[model samples]
Target: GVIKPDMKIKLKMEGNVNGHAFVIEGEGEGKPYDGTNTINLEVKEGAPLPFSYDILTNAFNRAFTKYPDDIPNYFKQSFPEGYSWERTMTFEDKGIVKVKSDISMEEDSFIYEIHLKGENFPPNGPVMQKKTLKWEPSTEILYVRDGVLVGDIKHKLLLEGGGHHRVDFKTIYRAKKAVKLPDYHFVDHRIEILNHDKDYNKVTVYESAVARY
Candidate 1:
């Protein structure tokens, strides 16, 4: 009838399902997690579907009154799978089992974010020639010379590094002015992102410091 803060609730579900078992405890401010901990809920023995515990547990959590919806859909989606609220089984005589469903509204929803770091280059570097080279997915890098020429033109790819992974040659070649260059490079047998794939990025080419003998 009346659900409030600090109330404990017992949940039961089939034991077969694999999912998280916990109830949204209270309403949090700014962020949902700011005010909640998922207590481990348990299921009764000899239940009808004892094997599918997580599935039913998850469903009950979603149906519970304390879950927040502001977070990413995936987070909310994770709490419910195949369970239902059996009933509230807490009281002051033993303990309190409360349900406050509004906690999610005051709390800030969380977002799972991803930031990918593209290949970085050295400072004062030469502009990469416009091209698309063959890629090796096993090592997320592309070889400098393993691409097919789309058009023809005069271009240069400078490789300057010293070590087991050093590239010491400036590949100079001439082709029909319409051919596009490959967009990848290899250093000491390692590959990296290609150039010329930027939508509106400008690249500057400079003279090589290497002296020809």
Candidate 2:
């Protein structure tokens, strides 16, 4: 399952559960989209339960294989109710579903992965490989104000991207210090990778030229 330049993929979710009503904007082809195109995130009625990992994983897989879509989703999700999560996935040589799950949440999140016999389930090639995000407070910073910190940090996220051999690596410049500010800010988003792991694609950042006095 290779992805053409304009493969035309669509995966989005909108629903109201546990007082978390999320709104989503769809993506057009040839546009920039993280590989995660299939996933399900839900906020049920309850406190964060014990064994939250196992419970959540079961729910995740169920929502993954059983969702409503011609293709699927795993882009980004927001659950206005103080919970959210995003996903990155693709069918490359280096395949892995890197889910950036915060408090918000994601449901019915899934993607079109190639056949891999079976892993957790008995009959499923799109069977998902799981890994908890290693969210270490890893970012760069330089003190500017009480809420203004301007700095740059580069971290490498190994083990994965799209098409075939979607397994590549990324050197990320994450802005941990310049968070929660709205007025004036410069930040780097996600970088793109190509080919069999050593593709050296491109670096993308939003508002690279936005500053104030």
Candidate 3:
């Protein structure tokens, strides 16, 4: 099901790569239906990174977090069988960057891959960064229990247009609560590297928070 009219969501992330550590805390609220049901969230950047914060935020949000009302239909059409769906759209704030997503579902899970590209994208400049993201629901069952829908969500991100930078993130959401608000917790880990002078070869740590309606 989609987020309820009174729904509130909180997301937290804590992890680090190399020596640079960071934490992100954010909250999102369900707004009245606008042509396309959407939720907008704001996250506070903890520190500066080798890349722009906008690049990281957009990459993460588009790939894993931004769930719209139509998401319910996407899941319904994939279950008890298999199917593939694709779509593209443009974001004004990010210049001419166009976002494309390909979603598919197999026996027991769903996978979503997103690509961001345009004139102002990465490796081209910093105004925007070209990014590719892969997201999937855990093989385990995800359903409504006690009025709450809970499940495991995983994601992998490739940045710099050519895989120059990569990150892996995992999290779980206690959503669709019947009594209160929803909550999420995520922990990120590192496993690979392509650049960064080889100085960035280990895993660091960070964290975040949210509020209820």
The global C-alpha lDDT for each of the candidates, from Candidate 1 onward, is 0.21, 0.23, 0.30
Measured by TM-score, the strongest candidate is 3
Off by over 4 Å in 2: 15-18, 23-25, 31-213
lDDT of predicted model 3 = 0.30
Residue-wise lDDT of candidate 2 within 104-160, one digit each (tens)? 222322222111111122121222232222111222222234433223333333322
lDDT of 3 by residue, 1-213 (tens): 222223332444342322334554434332212111122323234344333343334322111222344234222323333222222222223333233333333322233343433333233343323233221111222334444433332333444454433222221222211233233323122222211222222222111211111
Q: At residue 182, give the lDDT of candidate 3.
A: 30
Q: Point to the candidate with the largest lDDT.
A: 3
lDDT of 3 at 164: 30
RMSD to the native, candidate 3? Answer: 16.3
Q: Tens digit of lDDT per residue, candidate 1, span 21-56?
A: 222111111212222323332223322321211111
